[PDB]
Design a protein around this ligand. Structure first.
Ligand SMILES: C=C1[C@@H](O)[C@@H]2O[C@]3(CC[C@H](/C=C/[C@@H](C)[C@@H]4CC(C)=C[C@@]5(O[C@H](C[C@@](C)(O)C(=O)O)CC[C@H]5O)O4)O3)CC[C@H]2O[C@@H]1[C@@H](O)C[C@H](C)[C@H]1O[C@@]2(CCCCO2)CC[C@H]1C
Length: 187
């Protein structure tokens, strides 16, 4: 492979940071951080409660498949921030990466869209996005305008997938609002 841009690495540090914080701000995360994070997620997103019995598997698959490239790592393995960034670099080159993001996103979307409409209102999306990202200033990023480019007042599942795929893969566009799909960037 080539090398990721500095901007893309910053985006990946932005993915990793909340997990690092969950694990005690040690600079690394473990399988246990994600297992413990199940309860935290059920409290923050009670929309996930109807599928709470699937959460431990989701955490474990996240550790093995997303964080560690499908490899079973030793008990106690400590994945560092910089390592996650390089593992994510390999991951986004996988032929099935886009599908993996969509499948994961479907698990969240089905909790917030119980009637299976395929969309939510822009105001609902704004409140939910603030909850997801913990960025109280998410609206000012422009992301809701950039997703709803025709001003329908709706945000579709596909809108959010498009923003997220840009975030996980784009190298050089540093100003587009889709940069902020996970909230304000860390250093
Ligand atoms: C939430 C998320 C992202 O974080 C999540 O990121 C991914 C990348 C890494 C992350 C994995 C996290 C694991 C550790 C956890 C562990 C457990 C047990 C469950 C699970 O839980 C995740 C949600 C949550 C809360 O628990 C979290 O940890 O993230 C979803 C996948 C599940 O397997 O994975 O999964 C891909 C799927 C994606 O799915 C949604 C994403 O589609 C949300 C979407 C982008 C949002 O768009 C909007 C508009 C744009 C601005 C932002 O707001 C409105 C609201 C919402 C639709």
């Amino acid at each position: 492979l080539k090398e990721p841009s500095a901007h893309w690495c910053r985006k990946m540090r932005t993915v990793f940071r909340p997990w690092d914080v969950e694990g005690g701000s040690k600079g690394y995360v473990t399988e246990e951080v994600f297992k413990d994070g199940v309860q935290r997620r059920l409290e923050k997103f009670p929309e996930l409660a109807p599928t709470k019995d699937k959460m431990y598997e989701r955490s474990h698959r996240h550790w093995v498949n997303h964080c560690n490239l499908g490899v079973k790592m030793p008990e106690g393995y400590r994945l560092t921030e910089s390592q996650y960034v390089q593992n994510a670099w390999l991951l986004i080159h996988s032929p099935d990466f886009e599908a993996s993001l969509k499948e994961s996103s479907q698990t969240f979307w089905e909790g917030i869209d119980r009637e299976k409409k395929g969309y939510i209102t822009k105001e609902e999306a704004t409140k939910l996005g603030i909850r997801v990202t913990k960025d109280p200033n998410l609206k000012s990023t422009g992301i809701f305008e950039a997703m709803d480019e025709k001003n329908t007042g709706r945000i579709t599942f596909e809108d959010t997938l498009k923003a997220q795929l840009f975030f996980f893969t784009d190298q050089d566009n540093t100003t587009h609002p889709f940069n902020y799909v996970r909230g304000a960037l860390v250093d």
